[PDB]
Amino acid sequence: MDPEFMSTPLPAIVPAARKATAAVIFLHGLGDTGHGWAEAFAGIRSSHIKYICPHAPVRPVTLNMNVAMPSWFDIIGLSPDSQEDESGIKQAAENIKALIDQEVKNGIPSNRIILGGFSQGGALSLYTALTTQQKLAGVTALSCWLPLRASFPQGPIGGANRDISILQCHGDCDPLVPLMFGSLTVEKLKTLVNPANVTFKTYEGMMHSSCQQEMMDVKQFIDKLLPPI
């Protein structure tokens, strides 16, 4: 994981109670933190899964009037039209692939790893899973979008994650990332990957955040795809 990406602390971690036979790598969004997500995932933790919430390098963010904060990549705007930080997204994807590889070198195979995240961290989880040849168990993409959408095929993507399971979650009251982004993303994902394994859930009254019912759907998705043994 490259130089900007090892400026941060080691990830916030929820350990497995038993020995860990699977992992969830969960990427936060602008503002929310690795720590905050680790406390959320503690509430749904499985005895054999380790939950890894890495920290993003601290860098000015254009959307936030150039204030320096943890950020996987720059965000310029959140309209469907907005220009995107292509090079930063690709760079961040290579670091996330490196992070998956660190779990693989520690004994947990990539097909026992779910990658997920919130807002630009969910966008990055989708981008990363659809562009890596590491086979992953699934993706949880919460209140987000598919970055660099026009760079993707108009049909199936093929390669290792062509049949990956994806749960995409969105709030119906999100004032930052419009529900339309979630919708247009699930549409695009049903052409990129096998649509049998793509599920879209929306939450009434949820804004740009998670909620308890969403965390229960995320738990059921993770647990079913990463069962014991």
CB atoms within 10 A of CB 18: 11
For residues 162 and 195, is the Cβ–Cβ distance under 8 A?
Answer: no
User: Of 55, 143, 165, 174, which is the active-site residue?
Assistant: 174
User: Of 46, 110, 119, 143, which is the active-site residue?
Assistant: 119
- DSSP conformational letter for 149: G
Name residue 104's amino acid.
Answer: V
Number of residues binding to Br ion, judged by CB under 5 A: 39
Closest residue to Br ion, based on beta-carbon distance: 36
Separation in Å, CA 198 to CA 98, 103, 187, 193: 25, 25, 10, 8
CB atoms within 10 A of CB 203: 21
Q: Distance (Å, rounded) from C-alpha 144 to C-alpha 177?
A: 7
Pick the stretch among 109-117, 128-136, 156-164 that binds Br ion (CB under 5 A): 156-164
Contact call for residue 228 and Br ion (CB under 5 A): yes
For residues 24 and 108, is the Cβ–Cβ distance under 8 A?
Answer: no
Q: Least Å distance between CB 28 and Br ion?
A: 6
- Tell me the backbone φ, ψ of residue 75, rounded to 5 degrees: -125, 130
Write out the binding residues for Br ion, residues 29-48 only, by CB under 5 A. 29-30, 32-34, 36, 48
Pick the stretch among 109-117, 125-133, 154-162, 214-222 that binds Br ion (CB under 5 A): 214-222
Q: Which of 24, 38, 54, 71 binds Br ion (CB under 5 A)?
A: 54
Contact call for residue 148 and Br ion (CB under 5 A): yes
Pick the stretch among 109-117, 125-133, 152-160, 205-213 that binds Br ion (CB under 5 A): 205-213
Name residue 186's amino acid.
Answer: V
> Is 46 known to be catalytic?
no
Q: Binding string to Br ion for residues 167 to 186, with x set by CB under 5 A, is what?
A: x-----x-x-----------
Largest CA distance in the chain: 48
Q: Least Å distance between CB 91 and Br ion?
A: 14
Separation in Å, CA 70 to CA 31, 64, 135, 197: 7, 12, 28, 32
> Is 143 known to be catalytic?
no
Q: Which two tokens stand for residue 81?
A: 């039209």
Contact call for residue 200 and Br ion (CB under 5 A): yes
Contact call for residue 151 and Br ion (CB under 5 A): yes
Q: Give the residue with the Cβ less far from Br ion, 66 or 212.
A: 212
Q: Which two tokens stand for residue 166?
A: 């994806």
Q: Using only the alpha carbons of the chain, give its radius of gyration.
A: 16
Give catalytic residue positions: 119, 174, 208
What does the binding site for Br ion look like in residue numbers (CB under 5 A)? 9-10, 15-16, 20-21, 29-30, 32-34, 36, 48, 50, 54-55, 70, 107, 119-120, 148, 150-151, 163, 165, 167, 173, 175, 197, 199-200, 209-213, 221, 228-229
